[PDB]
Ligand binder design. Structure first.
Ligand SMILES: [Ca+2]
Ligand SMILES: [Ca+2]
Ligand SMILES: [Mn+2]
Ligand SMILES: [Mn+2]
Ligand SMILES: [Mn+2]
Ligand SMILES: [Mn+2]
Ligand code: NA
Ligand code: NA
Lengths: 617, 617
């Protein structure tokens, strides 16, 4: 484990330093998250890993005068125990006797204690829950503005500050000026004077900009404040002065004043927000996400604070316009070309005995990089053979890197960001003869996949109402999968994007409408044996029906992912005619669209593979 | 219309009377609801009808110095306009230009106005929404303790105060002492000192008592406060002194003190709650429903107020024990006997031309009353032929009472309270030859009904996740129904009971578990032509499956309703084998269970009908 005895000594001393706290605090909370509720935390924000040695993706540390405790989930019980030294106490989340953070605190704190946390990195949700319980026991939760880990972290990496990319109308369908105008119409109809934007993907979409400050998600560290007559963009770096960016943002015009973007330092967000709020008149509202940091939300006086589950940006960007959806189609056509090359290569090379989980993942990236306007992977590839495939959240380590073979089911989940769009696809396959049980499970999963993709439903049906269609065949045999059926997908933006989706986990998802894009990804995982998942990105599209009730219209799903589904894995005699017709048609569509592209790109061998793999059942 | 000019004059004067208000109020709100959020409002509480002349089931009146406005929904636009005189302004809810109550108020009120409402008859939800908007415009929402309509309502009927009925262990499965003990264990594990019970069905279930103060729902006006060491029942009437009731409630013992029920006047609820709250120490909590009246909730100081979506009584009573579920089976067997007699009678009598929607409803009640321990109808019968059937909320009027015929689809939805249990059943039928479209729609509805009833799903699946199964066949052809698929059902208690159910309207319903009872009732309504609904009460039951994932087990539904589904209405060639087998089996189960009962009861003619109507397809 990392030796953290001296780090803890220094942190405990910082907890008492008058420069940071008016009075000493008896406990300090170090969460995983960053200031924007990011999905992938930048190295500079991996404070919990720094103080503990535990560097998994999830975990909350709490340091007291006497104790250092770490809460993490099942993925990490073993990792945390190994990585942390004897200073640390492991709190195994999910287990029956594991105390909550707040109840643990009450049990270890002396009378009338102060508990500190950096307010920029927790939401109000968490603040309220913690503050309540602590207050009951005579304690106080204190926002400590200076991050205490940063104070002791001598060799803390700089915040990533990478180039910006501009996206033109061909890609976005609508200008940033028009997006801001649309947003202001929504603000006016609600007496909102100011809208504070804290989610990095929302800022990227609003200004038609992209970046690479965060892994996978093509976003950049920033905030924005939108007024009715002004715009304030909080961003660091000379990147903002690149000629393409100046031109795109109209920064060297003598333009109309309401579209003049004021560029402020990234650190200035709270002080500029405080100054605007100081000047509010009684009925004036400030819109903020209910997901925003406590520091940002608390800056807005309660009387003026208009919290919302989903900002109007989240709602607008959920529906892809024709430029965006055409980009998604293009991105998927390129991605399928790359996967035809990959799967052909796998069929040739796996029997030779040298293909490993990592080398196959490497090869997937290699083929993707050949395609025009490839940017990066949209998430880390999952490449799992045999028992590894049952581990839903499995990520490579060289010492448990398995060799692909003719005797094990292989699952590959992978995806890319292209300038045109964003992909996410899982296929499960076998290189010789699968067992009947492997085929049985695959076929239940496929039945669910088709039940969702072929579903016809009224406009405005919430996606969660499609989730059980994916599960019916599994459920009938006593099987299930412990994940959601689908999520929204961004347009050259986060592969995991709300507010639409298909899950049993929420009823508050947005009604499905034409232009939304989601995944359809049922699976089945047999611990110690194999895993199966069949995942496509699908576009919500209008569809004509026999009858027309209550007006409104109906919708169905159209796959953008065009990659064969391996027929040897299917118990064909168990399919309905509808399912058989669906797969045959899907396969001919793959052959049409991807085959044309393969021929255009001169990729004969991959085209031959695609034709073999798209034969009817 | 009713002449309400003088009533309004008197109400306007009451709004300024120092005996009722410290200062005059400029507006007064008169809602539909009563103090317990009852489903069926007692005549004495029909205040909105009294002041306006409009006596539909839904509507909110607001009286100002200058205006009298009525908000109601689509069912009642015509009724309200006809029943109210020229003093009244109709506010058509749902329509685009119809203002909300609170925005209408701001538009008609003078500066710095007070708006009054009786706090006993609105929830905090409504109070908060109204108070906020009014406060913004410089106005104040005032709780006015003395109901102002009652002050002017000279011939107001007395509150119903009907006999109480006791239910023994054979019916309830568990004593009230044991229910109170269970509730107290839940209170202790939450540091709750007091639990205020405001829902009439919860009080009935807790004390194993029933009544008839409210139409249909077998409940009695009361409140209860449960402490850890005391019980307080707020109830009026010498009914509490009936020997059976004294014995049941252990009121003439020298019993252990924690089960001594203190009987207080019904009106004393607020003053006794205020006195208990005066004595709370800092960390002591009082449990109240978030549905409770503002008057009750506000009595509890905010620091001590522990609001909950579902009380622990609501959660416990949702799961029927074996005594309760066996009662439900018995009640359904009796109800089916009555319906076999009814449907046989219909087949004989409709061709003679004298059967009307009302006479058929009357006959349904007549046959039910023959059965042992019939108590009353569980809701008003819906009896609709032809176009009436498309009107989801249709209730008889003698001048639109249609004659049943050989040329129209007939829908009958009916149900009873028996001492043993509660029923709710819809059947749709035809007395000669239906059209292909009528059969097409019926078959889509039946497919949905079977998809739900035959569903197999993991324990703890939320019922809302079954809703789309009922709709798939309709949806595929562009049809739908604008109501939920099912609701929970009480045990000799409200036919409409949560917190479980099957609806697109909520994601916050409770996970399904063995012992819950719900309806399965898809339909289809063709405006100006016909309606179809096929409704059974079903019990959630365990079921063995081929495989066993994640432990937990699986569940399915077992119909308690045993009434034939008419095969002439079905496009049989369109059914799957699963659906055909389901119906054949269901019909033989009807024949077994109900046939045995008919034979035992000596009902030969009805038995002959049942055998004809349960032949295989
Ligand atoms: Ca084999
Ligand atoms: Ca006919
Ligand atoms: Mn994926
Ligand atoms: Mn995915
Ligand atoms: Mn009914
Ligand atoms: Mn019903
Ligand atoms: Na999930
Ligand atoms: Na409904």
């Amino acid at each position: 484990p990392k030796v953290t005895s001296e780090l803890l000594r220094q942190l405990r001393q910082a907890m008492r330093n008058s420069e940071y706290v008016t009075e000493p605090i008896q406990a300090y909370i170090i969460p995983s998250g960053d200031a924007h509720q990011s999905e992938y935390i930048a190295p500079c924000d991996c404070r919990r890993a720094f103080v503990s040695g535990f560097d998994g993706s999830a975990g909350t540390a709490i340091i007291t005068e006497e104790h250092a405790a770490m809460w993490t989930d099942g993925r990490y019980f073993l990792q945390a125990a190994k990585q942390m030294d004897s200073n640390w106490t492991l709190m195994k989340m999910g287990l029956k006797d594991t105390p909550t953070q707040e109840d643990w605190l009450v049990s270890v704190l002396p009378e009338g204690s102060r508990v500190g946390v950096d307010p920029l990195i927790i939401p109000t949700d968490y603040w309220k829950k913690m503050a309540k319980v602590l207050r009951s026991a005579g304690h106080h939760l204190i926002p400590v503005k200076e991050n205490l880990v940063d104070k002791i972290w001598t060799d803390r990496p700089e915040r990533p500050c990478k180039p910006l990319l501009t996206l033109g109308l061909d890609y976005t369908g609508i200008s940033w000026k028009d997006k801001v105008a649309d947003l202001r119409l929504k603000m006016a109809e609600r007496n909102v004077m100011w809208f504070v934007v804290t989610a990095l993907d929302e800022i990227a979409w609003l200004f038609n900009l992209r970046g690479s400050d965060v892994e996978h998600n093509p976003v950049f560290f920033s905030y924005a404040i939108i007024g009715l007559e002004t715009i304030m963009l909080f961003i660091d770096g000379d990147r903002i002065d690149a000629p393409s960016v100046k031109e795109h943002l109209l920064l060297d015009l003598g333009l109309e004043a309401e579209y003049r973007i004021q560029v402020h330092p990234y650190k200035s967000i709270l002080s500029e927000l405080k100054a605007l709020c100081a000047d509010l008149s009684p009925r004036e509202k400030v819109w903020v996400s209910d997901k925003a940091s406590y520091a940002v939300s608390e800056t807005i006086p309660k009387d003026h604070r208009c919290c919302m589950p989903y900002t109007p940006i989240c709602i607008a960007k959920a529906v892809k316009n024709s430029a965006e959806s055409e980009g998604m189609r293009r991105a998927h056509i390129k991605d399928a070309v790359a996967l035809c090359e990959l799967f052909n290569w796998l069929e040739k090379e796996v029997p030779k005995g040298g293909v490993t989980e990592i080398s196959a993942a490497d090869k997937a990236e290699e083929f993707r990089r050949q395609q025009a306007d490839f940017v990066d992977l949209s998430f880390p590839t999952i490449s799992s053979t045999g028992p590894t495939g049952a581990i839903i959240h499995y990520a490579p380590v060289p010492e448990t890197n398995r060799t692909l073979s003719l005797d094990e089911v292989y699952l590959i989940d992978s995806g890319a960001q292209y300038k045109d769009g964003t992909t996410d696809v899982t296929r499960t396959m076998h290189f010789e003869t699968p067992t009947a049980y492997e085929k049985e499970c695959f076929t239940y999963v496929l039945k669910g996949h088709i039940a969702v993709s072929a579903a016809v439903f009224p406009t405005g049906t919430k996606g969660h109402l499609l989730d059980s269609f994916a599960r019916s065949a599994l459920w009938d045999s006593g099987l299930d999968y412990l994940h959601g059926t689908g999520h929204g997908v961004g347009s050259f933006l986060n592969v995991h994007e709300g507010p639409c989706g298909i899950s049993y986990k929420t009823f508050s998802d947005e009604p499905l409408e034409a232009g939304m894009i989601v995944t359809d990804e049922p699976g089945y995982y047999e611990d110690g044996a194999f895993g199966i998942r069949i995942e496509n990105v699908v576009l919500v599209v209008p569809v004509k029906t026999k009858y027309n009730f209550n007006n409104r219209g109906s919708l169905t799903l159209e796959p953008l992912t065009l990659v064969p589904i391996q027929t040897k894995m299917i118990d064909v005699d168990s399919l309905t005619d509808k399912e058989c017709d669906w797969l045959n048609n899907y396969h001919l569509t793959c052959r049409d669209v991807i085959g044309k592209e393969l021929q255009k790109q001169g990729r004969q061998e991959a085209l031959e593979w695609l034709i073999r793999e798209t034969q009817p059942i």
